Structure formats: C-alpha cells, structure tokens
Amino acid sequence: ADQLTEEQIAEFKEAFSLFDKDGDGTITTKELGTVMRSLGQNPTEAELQDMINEVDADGNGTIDFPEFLTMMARKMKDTDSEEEIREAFRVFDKDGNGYISAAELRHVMTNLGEKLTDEEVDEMIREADIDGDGQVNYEEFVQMMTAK
C-alpha cells in the first residue's frame, strides 16, 4: 500500500465517506448493509459479518479506513457479474442497437413458451422503462433484474 499516498487516500476517502454514516471512521452491517442493498445485494447478517471479518485486519470488528481499501479491491470483481447479465440483454435485443422495444422483447418472451399481447408486455415495459419511451435499454434492463 505504498502507492496509495495522500493522492490515493483522498480518492478512496470518498468511497469510505459515503459508507461511514455514523461519521467516525468505521463500517458495520448497519452501514455496509445500507449501501450494499442499494445496488441489489440485500446480504444477510451472516453475509455482512463474513465480509466485514474478511477485511477486518486491525482486530476490532468494524472495517477501518485502511482495511476498507482491501474490500474495494475484492468488491470490484464481485460486481463483475454485471457482464454475466449482459448476455441476456443481447438475446432480448433483436436488432442489436441498445434499446429493447416492446415488440422486440415481446417476441422473445413468446419463445419461452407462452402467448403474450401488447397489453401484457406493456405492463412489463412500465417496469424497467424509467424515462418512459416504451423501451428497455441496458440500464433499464439491469434495474429490472435487480428490482423486487
């Protein structure tokens, strides 16, 4: 961690300032769990504890400024899954431009083994479609997947 002087410390700081809700310099299930669920992880106590202990080095329990830096490194790959989902997005996108229209997706759904109508699909679009242009782009699609 020699190549992480004030230069890096400042950067990582922000990533460690948002998590630390209490405002002391540590992170716990309460904090980490407050941001982790924001993305769509909703990790259980056992999960948070395991992640906290894994990074916990000092030997106290709650992640610190230095220890945290360790997670931000491993947690960077944990999200990699993003791609694993991309593939799916492609399938739906027939034309292959970026936005998944109602018709494009509508057809896909059928393949599964059912017969849906503009109405049925409409209810779906209003789910992922954020802006409301009758489309479901990558971003809009991702949210849906991680939306309960």
Ligand SMILES: [Ca+2]
């Ligand atoms: Ca804290």
Ligand SMILES: [Ca+2]
């Ligand atoms: Ca710690």
Ligand SMILES: [Ca+2]
């Ligand atoms: Ca499309």
Ligand SMILES: [Ca+2]
């Ligand atoms: Ca859209």
